Amino acid sequence: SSEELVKQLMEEIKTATEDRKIDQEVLQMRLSHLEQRMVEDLESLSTLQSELLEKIELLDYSSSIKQIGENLKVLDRSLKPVITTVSLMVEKVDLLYGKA
Amino acid sequence: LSSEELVKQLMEEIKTATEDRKIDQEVLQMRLSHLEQRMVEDLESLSTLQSELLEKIELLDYSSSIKQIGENLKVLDRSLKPVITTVSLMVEKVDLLYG
Amino acid sequence: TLSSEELVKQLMEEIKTATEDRKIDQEVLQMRLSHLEQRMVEDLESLSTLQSELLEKIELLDYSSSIKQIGENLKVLDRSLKPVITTVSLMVEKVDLLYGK
Amino acid sequence: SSEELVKQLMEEIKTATEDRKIDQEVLQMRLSHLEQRMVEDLESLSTLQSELLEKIELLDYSSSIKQIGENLKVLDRSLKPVITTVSLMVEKVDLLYGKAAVG
């Protein structure tokens, strides 16, 4: 019963090492689940992030707005000569109208 | 200092250490599950925010307003120098008729 | 030179030093997960903030009205010019006919 | 078969201890893989977000759109007299055209 206490105990360590074997199964099951959920979800986020990027570059109107701006400055330029050419016609027409 | 008493001491040392290791394992299982639940909670939030960025950014669509302005700017261009030039011609033609 | 009783006692001091060291080793594996959770919590918090700060910035970059106005003002300036263009248009038809004779 | 039992038990404990030592090393190894994957993925999201913060600044036309609004108002104000002036002048051309047209 000292030699039967060693008997029982060698069965406990056999028992406990079987338990530990399953305990380590469950652990791998939770680890893998986290790793797989991390790529499903940290990945999913990256898609949308990049889908947003697409639309940000599809709503770049810097070129259209630079151009509108520049076309408006051409008109505003041609105002100078226009007023000049009109003012010379006014006196010309004023002269014919006084000497008709 | 018996043998049957000293095997029993070692029996309870091992029994304890086995109880300890089990707990350690259940602690680790809980911490892994907690981390995964927290990560999911916090990503679902970010994931929602990013969908409302996808919509909200359509506020920055001006494609149509911008085409209409490009065209009205052509209309203005035809409304100025080409008109004056025909007027200057016209005044030239009247001027001769009075000669 | 190995009494059964003496091998047991040696096994108990052995096991005792292994149960202490097993303890420290497990506390480190535990705190590895606490450290990673925190790291993840902090970085996702920062992400979330920027996301909100981006949302506020999109609202500060809506010049949709300010563009519609320029769109309209410009329609108004063009409409303001049709009457004079018509007048010139008619006078030119009349003058060119007389000049061509 | 007292000392030879202890010596057998000791061997069972040795194989149990060393199996555990390895399971710990295997766990430490998956944890390092987890730590490195998590950090690499979070650094990517943080990279891609700060690239987002920059691209969106390209849609800040405020400076341009003020200048457009400004340059238009000028033109619109600067044209009001030019319409008036050409309208009076074209009426006078009319009155001159009438006489030239009968004579």
Residue numbers in the entry:
A (entry chain A): 72 to 171
B (entry chain B): 71 to 169
C (entry chain C): 70 to 170
D (entry chain D): 72 to 174
Wording from the paper:
It self-associates in oligomers through a central oligomerisation domain (POD) and bridges the RdRp and the nucleocapsid. Here, we used X-ray diffusion and diffraction experiments to provide a complete structural analysis of BoDV-1 P. We observed that P possesses a modular architecture, consisting of a central oligomerisation domain (POD) surrounded by two disordered regions, similar to other Mononegavirales Ps. Using X-ray diffusion and diffraction experiments, we revealed that BoDV-1 P adopts a long coiled-coil α-helical structure split into two parts by an original β-strand twist motif, which is highly conserved across the members of whole Orthobornavirus genus and may regulate viral replication.
Crystals were obtained for the POD of munia bornavirus 1 (MuBV-1; 77% sequence identity with BoDV-1) and Gaboon viper virus 1 (GaVV-1; 41 and 43% sequence identity with BoDV-1 and MuBV-1, respectively). The structure of MuBV-1 POD was solved by molecular replacement using BoDV-1 POD as a starting model, whereas GaVV-1 POD was obtained de novo using Se-Met derivative crystals. For both MuBV-1 and GaVV-1, the asymmetric units contained a tetrameric POD, whereas the tetramer for BoDV-1 could be obtained after applying the inherent symmetry operations of the tetragonal space group. MuBV-1 and GaVV-1 POD presented similar architectures composed of two α-helical coiled-coils (the monomers being parallel) linked by a kink. Globally, the only differences concern the relative spatial position of the two coiled-coils, due to the inherent flexibility induced by such a break and the crystal packing. MuBV-1 and GaVV-1 breaks were also composed of three residues, with a strictly conserved aspartate in the middle. The Ramachandran analysis showed that all of them fall into the β-area, with neighbouring residues at intermediate positions; this confirms that this specificity is conserved in all Orthobornavirus P. Using the Vc determination on the diffusion data, the MW were estimated between 40 and 45 kDa, 12–16% lower than the theoretical values, all corresponding to tetramers. The three X-ray structures fit perfectly with the SAXS data.
